[PDB]
Write a protein that binds this ligand. Structure first.
Ligand SMILES: Nc1ncnc2c1ncn2[C@@H]1O[C@H](COP(=O)(O)OP(=O)(O)O)[C@@H](O)[C@H]1O
Lengths: 371, 530, 56, 56
């Protein structure tokens, strides 16, 4: 028997089988519902579209995200997402497959409890297990120590791990991520004349961000270069023609990660929270943590993020240290790759949560030793 | 006779016992009364086939060079007599080349599990012969011990008696030059390797396949040889592998029928499929080296299996083929003082075989008892040995722990040993401490088998068990300009057991092959020759 | 009688459409490649200045 | 009749030929920028190692 690794994330569902090299199904975690009336009788159209299909009918639908910041807000359409994942993308019956799911650190407990209640009662899986995303990222990166920065689409967190022991008092979590960057880009394009307001235009803006944004190595010098030259402008083609050109906005958007005061937050940049999570750790392991700074998740994919972050952490740390930023090319799938590795271990097959275990101990069994 | 066995010590001089008169005159005498000889069990297998309408299996068990070849030869002679042996012996030097290598106990040891199926018709008359290869060890193509060599073929090619092969393959005469081979015994007084090269070339030219095809075979082996000298370095301020030496890359590509830059890119930057897109995977030096080794082992084993298919096609006769009687040639329960991973695999295979025979003899004794009307002692004779099998194949067994360890991030041999001990020591029955006697080299743990207590060594198992096949380079091979595209024709939702390219282990492939070999044997009534 | 004129115009039109499609394909290809190469050179150049101040 | 559509197809065919011309000009400039960037990055990727050994 084989296990399923579902990295539901927040903004992309990645699913597959444990033991594969990459996720088999990758689609947005979106539920769309039609907002117009519908005139053609016999169309027989359905009430809610899920996943990658809802992006084709994006112009007719109003798109919801069932996961806001790691946390699941809408539970019915989350069951819809899972049903679509199991039956339409993977085509497997979950009554004979153990399921491994991921979650961010420092989340509500009811999230896990309802997740397992659903996975055991609605889908009847024989076993299940909820894992932390940063640990799986380290598994896939091949380290056993190192401080991992896992910037997804809802949540950013640091989890320092040494020799296989995680130091929970030094775990940082930040609610600035890819969706906040999309909203800042929507708000910042307005000053150039373009307006994107619909939930269907938020997807176009996300595409613009992915394909054109980048992190500046020196923010003030890049601002001066844009204010003087024009060698920064690039053009993008909207779905209906209507080419748009952006300059400053290319690097002003992901700079919010290093200056969260752009979107009105009080916290410090990802470089400074990484440094602070290191300084919370014991003095003996800071060498290895500095030397093993692992990036993962989609929001770490901007060109220049690693060089910028190395420059910052180097200017923060003492001069004797070797700062290294580990940023693989298959970065944004590291959580899933590590999850597959983990569920594929023979040593792991006694750490699942069984059906009868749950039936006898209630959903509270998720927080206990069967973690 | 020794019960259900047939034991045969080889005589070193000619005897009249192999004259056709005893062959013809045995017809009509029974097994229970006639004195022991392999003609007896041959006829008994034949008549068993004819009465039960089933296949039979002859399991000749001995060391290469102790008479196994000629024993099987006289078997096939007797079978022809009671009604294509020349073709078998004629194509044999090919297998002798491509599947034999020098070990310490023997200089012409067989590594693959040769097995000849002799079919028949409805009238029990000679119809055709089939052949299958099993359990061919791939680790030899890359790693060789301190006291042993690689396969014979590389040395036979290294015989300068064919200078056209060397000057067309860029093979310098010096055997120390090539790293895949130089770690083993360079040259030994085994045989006249030049003459053996000639005998194999003769067998090739008299076999169905053309001269271009032998040329491609030789050049492919030379390409496998050229894989070993590749050199990779880490990048400037990153963890990525990049090639510094490009000359052997260029020449290996020019041989293989690919582009050099393209093959280097396919090794340094694999591309994997994530849903509907492709993203590039990163590699370091260790990963790219493991991939190169797995690619070489794969292409060699592929060419070998296809050569066996060609041999069988040459042998193939259109006569209808009914029930067969197979004869099996397998490695032995080898013991040494520095047993290793390969010897563990061999002993695991022989464990499955011995347990199979033991259960067979159990059912035979139950048959004797149910005939005699005296039925007692209803315990089987197999589980007492299966208990040792459960320490290799079963989850949390040695093979599963090894797979998990070569999957884990920073695993080392000491950690492997610690996990073996923590998970088996005392809690098991057969796993136990090593023993240090007469100042033996080293031993990390000891298993007990049917053939005695064996002490195994850990060092190197993690590194040698990895088999990460590189899918982009496999696609390159599929797009070659050679015969290579046939060997690599195609190799690597709704319920998919597709294990990844990285989650591949020699031990797992070996367990699968052993499973299917057992499934082929367990359908035939067996017979055993010692 | 002008139908031959019409057909010939259709043929040259089809040829020109195929030509335009191929030219767009090559254009987008080379443009992706130039942008990626410029990204790489700018990144590594900044890295060169950093290792230069490091040497200093 | 057929004349309006004929000459309209003619005008858009000429304009698409203009698109071909400009697209090919963009192809030439793209080739130039790619090759020049390649030479520069060659210089840089061969001297970065010297810089790193200097600091070593
Ligand atoms: N090339 C890219 N550059 C910048 N941001 C990207 C890129 N690709 C994806 N993203 C961002 O990453 C987010 C998705 O990250 P992901 O790893 O899927 O997290 P999750 O799985 O929790 O959704 C998206 O919001 C998207 O904006």
């Amino acid at each position: 028997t084989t296990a399923l690794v579902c990295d539901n994330g927040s903004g992309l569902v990645k699913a597959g089988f444990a033991g594969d090299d990459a996720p088999r199904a990758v689609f947005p975690s979106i539920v769309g519902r039609p907002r117009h009336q519908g005139v053609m009788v016999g169309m027989g159209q359905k009430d809610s579209y899920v996943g990658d299909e809802a992006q084709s009918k994006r112009g007719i639908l109003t798109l919801k995200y069932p996961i806001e910041h790691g946390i699941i807000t809408n539970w019915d359409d989350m069951e819809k997402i899972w049903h679509h994942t199991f039956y339409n993308e993977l085509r497997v019956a979950p009554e004979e497959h153990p399921t491994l799911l991921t979650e961010a650190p420092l989340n509500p407990k009811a999230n896990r409890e309802k997740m397992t209640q659903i996975m055991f009662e609605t889908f009847n899986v024989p076993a299940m297990y909820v894992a932390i995303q940063a640990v799986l990222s380290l598994y896939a990166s091949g380290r056993t120590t190192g401080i991992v920065l896992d910037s997804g689409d809802g949540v950013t967190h640091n989890v320092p791990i040494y020799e296989g022991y995680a130091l929970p008092h030094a775990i940082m979590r930040l609610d600035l991520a890819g969706r906040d960057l999309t909203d800042y880009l929507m708000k910042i394009l307005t000053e150039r004349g373009y307006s994107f307001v619909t939930t269907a235009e938020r997807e176009i803006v996300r595409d613009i961000k992915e394909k054109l944004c980048y992190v500046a190595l020196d923010f003030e010098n890049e601002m001066a270069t844009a204010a003087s030259s024009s060698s920064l402008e690039k053009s993008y083609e909207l779905p209906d023609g209507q080419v748009i050109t952006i300059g400053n906005e290319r690097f002003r958007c992901p700079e919010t990660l290093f200056q969260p005061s752009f979107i009105g937050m009080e916290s410090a940049g990802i470089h400074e929270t990484t440094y602070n999570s290191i300084m919370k750790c014991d003095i003996d392991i800071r060498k290895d943590l500095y030397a093993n700074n692992v990036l993962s998740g989609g929001t770490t994919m901007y060109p220049g993020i690693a060089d910028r972050m190395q420059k910052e952490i180097t200017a923060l740390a003492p001069s004797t240290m070797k700062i290294k930023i580990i940023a693989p090319p298959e970065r944004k799938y590291s959580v899933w790759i590590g999850g597959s590795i983990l569920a594929s271990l023979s040593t792991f097959q006694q750490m699942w949560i069984s059906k009868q275990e749950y039936d006898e101990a209630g959903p509270s069994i998720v927080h206990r030793k069967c973690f | 006779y020794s019960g259900l066995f047939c034991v045969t010590v080889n005589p070193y001089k000619w005897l009249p016992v192999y004259t056709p008169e005893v062959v013809a005159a045995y017809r009509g005498k029974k097994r229970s009364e006639a004195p022991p000889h392999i003609f007896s069990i041959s006829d008994n297998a034949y008549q068993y086939m004819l009465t039960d309408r089933e296949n039979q299996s002859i399991l000749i068990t001995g060391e290469s060079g102790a008479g196994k070849t000629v024993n099987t030869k006289r078997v096939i002679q007797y079978f022809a007599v009671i009604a294509l042996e020349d073709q078998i012996i004629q194509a044999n030097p090919a297998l002798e080349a491509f599947g034999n290598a020098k070990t310490v106990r023997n200089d012409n040891s067989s590594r693959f599990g040769k097995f000849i199926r002799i079919h028949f018709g409805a009238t029990g008359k000679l119809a055709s012969a089939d052949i299958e290869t099993y359990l061919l060890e791939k680790s030899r193509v890359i790693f060789q011990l301190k006291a042993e060599r690689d396969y014979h073929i590389f040395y036979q090619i290294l015989s300068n008696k064919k200078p056209e092969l060397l000057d067309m393959l860029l093979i310098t005469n010096n055997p120390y030059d090539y790293a895949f081979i130089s770690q083993g015994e360079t040259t030994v007084a085994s045989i006249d390797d030049a003459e053996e090269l000639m005998a194999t070339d003769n067998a090739f030219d008299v076999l169905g396949f053309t001269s271009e095809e032998k040329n491609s075979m030789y050049k492919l082996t030379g390409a496998i040889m050229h894989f070993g000298n590749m050199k990779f370095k880490l990048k400037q301020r990153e963890e990525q592998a990049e090639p510094d030496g490009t000359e052997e890359a260029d020449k290996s590509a020019y041989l293989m029928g690919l582009n050099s830059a393209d093959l280097l890119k396919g090794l340094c930057h694999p591309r994997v499929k994530v849903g509907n897109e492709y993203v590039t995977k990163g590699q370091n030096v260790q990963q790219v080296i493991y991939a190169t080794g797995a690619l070489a082992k794969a292409v060699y084993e592929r060419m070998f299996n296809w050569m066996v298919t060609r041999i069988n096609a040459t042998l193939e006769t259109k006569q209808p083929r009914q029930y067969f009687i197979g004869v099996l040639d397998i490695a032995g329960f080898e013991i040494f003082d520095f047993n290793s991973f390969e010897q563990l695999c061999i002993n695991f295979t022989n464990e499955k075989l011995q347990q199979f025979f033991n259960h067979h003899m159990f059912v035979l004794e139950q048959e004797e008892y149910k005939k005699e009307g005296i039925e007692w002692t209803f315990i089987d004779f197999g589980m007492d040995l299966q208990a040792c099998i459960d320490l290799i194949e079963k989850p949390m067994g040695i093979m599963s722990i090894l797979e998990e360890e070569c999957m884990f991030p920073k695993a080392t041999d000491m950690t492997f040993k610690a996990k073996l001990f923590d998970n088996h020591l005392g809690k098991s029955a057969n796993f136990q401490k090593p023993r240090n006697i007469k100042g033996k080299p080293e031993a990390h743990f000891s298993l007990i088998h049917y053939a005695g207590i064996v002490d195994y060594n850990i060092i190197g198992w993690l590194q040698k068990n990895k088999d990460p096949l590189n899918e982009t380079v496999v696609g390159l091979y599929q797009k070659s300009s050679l015969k290579l595209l046939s060997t690599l024709f195609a190799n690597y939702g709704k319920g998919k057991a597709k294990k990844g390219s990285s989650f591949q282990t020699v031990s797992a492939l070996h367990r699968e092959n052993l499973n299917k070999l057992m499934t082929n044997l367990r359908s035939t009534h067996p017979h055993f020759v010692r | 009688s002008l139908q031959k004129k019409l057909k010939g115009t259709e043929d040259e039109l089809d040829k020109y459409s195929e030509a335009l499609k191929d030219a767009q394909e090559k254009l987008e290809l080379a443009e992706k490649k130039a942008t990626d190469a410029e990204a790489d050179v700018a990144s590594l150049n900044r890295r060169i200045q950093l290792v230069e101040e490091e040497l200093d």
